[PDB]
Specification:
The PDB classes it as antimicrobial protein. The chain is 25% helix and 28% strand. It is α/β, with parallel strands linked by helices. The chain has a single domain (7-231), classed as Metallo-beta-lactamase, Chain A. Strand 6 (103-106), helix 4 (108-117) and strand 7 form a beta-alpha-beta unit. The protein is globular. Bound molecules: ligand YSB and zinc ion (2 copies). One zinc ion (ZN) is lined by residues 87, 89, 169, 210-211. One zinc ion is lined by residues 85, 87, 89, 150-151, 169.
C-alpha cells in the first residue's frame, strides 16, 4: 500500500510496479534459486507513447506477468528492452519479450556470456560500451559501462529527465550484508567501478539496486564498503 515491495510481500510469479518519478517505474518480482527466494528489480522508462524496459523479471512466467502488469497500470506498449548483464535475473524472459514484439538489446559481451552460459540471448548488440567510462544514449536513457563489478559486462542506466540512477546488480541496497551472488564478480575492480559511477552521476537523486530497496547516492558508498569487506 505505498511502500517499496519486499521479497516476502511478492509471491513467485507475480510482479509489482513502483512509481519512481514522472515517467519512471521500477518492476519487482521474486524467484527461487538454489532453494532460496530472492527479489529483483528492473526499470520502465516512458519513451513518448512507448516504453523502454530495462531487464526482465527473472524468468519467462514472471516476464509474461510483467507485461500484463504494465498493460494494466500504464497501458503503453513496450517496444525495446535492454538487459544490463547476462544472468537469468536480467535476460530470463527475453524469449517472452521477443514473442511479444519487443526488440531486445544488450552489449556484445553480455550476448556472448549469455550464450556461453545457456541463458536467453538478446537479439541486438549495443556497441560503444566496451571500455570503462563509455556512455551511449538509448531513447530516454543513458547507458554507462563502469567496469567490472558484479560481472564483467554489467551496465548502469541513467534517466536524465529524472536524475534516476539504475545501478543494476553492480549496486546493492543499504541493508545488504555481503556482496550478493559473487559467482562472476571482480571484487578487486568493483570499488573502482563504483567510483566511476559516483564521478559520472553526481546529481543522481534516486539510486535503484539490482535487488532490494531504492535510496540515494549512499547506496554507492555502501556497495563499495560491503564489497571491500567481502573480498577481505
Ligand atoms: C540469477 C543470479 C542470482 C540468483 C540468486 C541470488 C542472486 C543475487 C543476490 C543474492 C543475495 C542478496 C542479498 S545481499 C546483497 O545482502 O547479500 C542480493 F541482493 C542479491 C544476485 C546479485 O547479487 O546480483 N544475483 C543472484 N545469479 C545466478 C548466478 C550463477 C552464475 C554462474 N556462473 C552459474 C554459476 O550468478 C548470479 O548473479
Ligand atoms: Zn548477476
Ligand atoms: Zn543480480
Amino acid at each position: 500500500s505505498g511502500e517499496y515491495p519486499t521479497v516476502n510481500e511478492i509471491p513467485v510469479g507475480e510482479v509489482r510496479l513502483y512509481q519512481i518519478a514522472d515517467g519512471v517505474w521500477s518492476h519487482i518480482a521474486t524467484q527461487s534459486f538454489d532453494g532460496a527466494v530472492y527479489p529483483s528489480n528492473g526499470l520502465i522508462v516512458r519513451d513518448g507513447d512507448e516504453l523502454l524496459l530495462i531487464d526482465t523479471a527473472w524468468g519467462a512466467k514472471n516476464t509474461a506477468a510483467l507485461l500484463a502488469e504494465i498493460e494494466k497500470q500504464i497501458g503503453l506498449p513496450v517496444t525495446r528492452a535492454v538487459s544490463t548483464h547476462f544472468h537469468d535475473d536480467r535476460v530470463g524472459g527475453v524469449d517472452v519479450l521477443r514473442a511479444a514484439g519487443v526488440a531486445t538489446y544488450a552489449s556484445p559481451s553480455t550476448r556472448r556470456l549469455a550464450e556461453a552460459e545457456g541463458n536467453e540471448i538478446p537479439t541486438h548488440s549495443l556497441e560503444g560500451l566496451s571500455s570503462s567510462g563509455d556512455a551511449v544514449r538509448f531513447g530516454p536513457v543513458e547507458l554507462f559501462y563502469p567496469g567490472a563489478a558484479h560481472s564483467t559486462d554489467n551496465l548502469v542506466v541513467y534517466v536524465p529527465s529524472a536524475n534516476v540512477l539504475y545501478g543494476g546488480c553492480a549496486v546493492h541496497e543499504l541493508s545488504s550484508t555481503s556482496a550478493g551472488n559473487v559467482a562472476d564478480a571482480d571484487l578487486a575492480e568493483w570499488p573502482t567501478s563504483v567510483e566511476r559511477i559516483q564521478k559520472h552521476y553526481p546529481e543522481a537523486e534516486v539510486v535503484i539496486p539490482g535487488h532490494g530497496l531504492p535510496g540515494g547516492l549512499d547506496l554507492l558508498q555502501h556497495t563499495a564498503n560491503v564489497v571491500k569487506a567481502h573480498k577481505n
